[PDB]
Write a protein that binds this ligand. Sequence first.
Ligand SMILES: Cc1nc2c(s1)-c1nc(/N=C3\C=C([N+](=O)[O-])C=CC3)ncc1CC2
Lengths: 296, 258
Amino acid sequence: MENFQKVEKIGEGTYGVVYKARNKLTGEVVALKKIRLDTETEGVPSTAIREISLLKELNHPNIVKLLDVIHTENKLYLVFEFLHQDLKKFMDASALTGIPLPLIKSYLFQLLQGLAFCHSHRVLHRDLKPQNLLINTEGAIKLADFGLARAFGVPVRTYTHEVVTLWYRAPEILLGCKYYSTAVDIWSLGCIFAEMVTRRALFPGDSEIDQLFRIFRTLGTPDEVVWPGVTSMPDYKPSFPKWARQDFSKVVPPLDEDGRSLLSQMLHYDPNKRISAKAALAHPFFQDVTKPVPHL
Amino acid sequence: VPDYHEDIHTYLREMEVKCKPKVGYMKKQPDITNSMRAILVDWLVEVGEEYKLQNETLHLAVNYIDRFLSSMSVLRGKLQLVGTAAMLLASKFEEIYPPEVAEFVYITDDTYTKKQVLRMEHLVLKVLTFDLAAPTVNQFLTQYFLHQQPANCKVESLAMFLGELSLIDADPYLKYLPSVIAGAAFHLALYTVTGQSWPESLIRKTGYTLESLKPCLMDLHQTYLKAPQHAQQSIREKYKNSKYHGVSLLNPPETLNL
Ligand SMILES: Cc1nc2c(s1)-c1nc(/N=C3\C=C([N+](=O)[O-])C=CC3)ncc1CC2
């Protein structure tokens, strides 16, 4: 820690405060995530245990690079590579003007490559949201904050007292299924994709029932035909309203046909029919993907 | 619906080779023995049952212990402190909400303090270089189950039972990789219950001929026969419950016909 100089605070994660810092010896600018580890608590928090272990297995351009873990008596520091800012800020700053389509398509392509890498190395992220996605001045976007990430060598069980986002939560989780799957991450990335295009959150719910009704009123109320088993799920009720699927052209106007085809395959109700990250990368939407740079 | 099961099974086969405990590590331990390890591992089974923990949490804790005991010398009075620390870390990694540290101290009959357990946790992390996502027999067995034709609850619960028994005895089962034990376990459950064998689907996927599984299938058979006489009984008692379809009451085959 002697070699690092704290420049400024850049944020707060799922366990500690984060600073921008520079290596006095090499010059490299980093992001120092500091967790206080006094005496009496529960020890090293589980969020830290998972982020460190999973993240040091994952080496990929579209996943934040954990550079070093500095280990002391009363504090634990995680040294990450520094990125310029997060998506949420870039969205708010690019609100009204809009994020250019080519930069949207580049970003989703890169996010899908990172997600395909995670899933093939049995890692669920579970918390994909604009605040957790980081961008730099060169046009890269990277998956970050793996505190709630789980290894799914054995199926990952559902929380109930949750602790996740909402907004970017998959419908099968809201309807009470027992297990997570890689489909919940693709649902989140679909919502973010729609959000960059419409410049606003797709399903901004205030509770679980409020969140379901926001999905329902945009994609229609699911039945046995689109999603067999859906009427025999714990949190499903036959009193739910019977709404109809709206035309995708009125939900994401500024999107071409290839784009709407993709978004609709990412927001498929049935987790089995929902498109995988690997499959999405082969989609015609990404046939003309370029690498533009943001106005940052 | 898969798409990367093959990628995952490939990657788990890479990782188990790297996350493997040193095979002859107990000979180089001055104060501790395989029999002491058997008591520790068995106590952890009872801790799992008492605290309603996942069967995977158990498998990961044993892996942590075996890796930690591969590079650090430990005296008998501290072996339980290593195991408690291992279980606390496996609980933080695999459980949604792990038991509090206060609970992990109470299970030790106040042999250790909260301070010591918190300190061991930190030492365990340092020795293992924060590599906690280790492949387990339990993991491979879950994948192998997808190649059942058809599914059988007794086969699944029996396979698990035999997989947990291998955790108690380092004396043979540290020379086999988790995937191989999982294979032996899977065949022997299949054979005892329905008379079926280690399927063709898994021979092509894993590359393990029934003949390659034979050495391990022999040791596990004896263990299954000798189980009711073993010094350690926590796993048999655990798998007598109706939630595991009473698979431990079942009669082992007298021969295997290999
Ligand atoms: C909770 C968090 N985890 C990380 C964060 S934030 C992180 N952020 C950044 N970059 C910045 C992020 C922001 N921001 O608005 O979150 C602002 C300036 C820089 N750069 C690197 C990281 C590393 C991982």
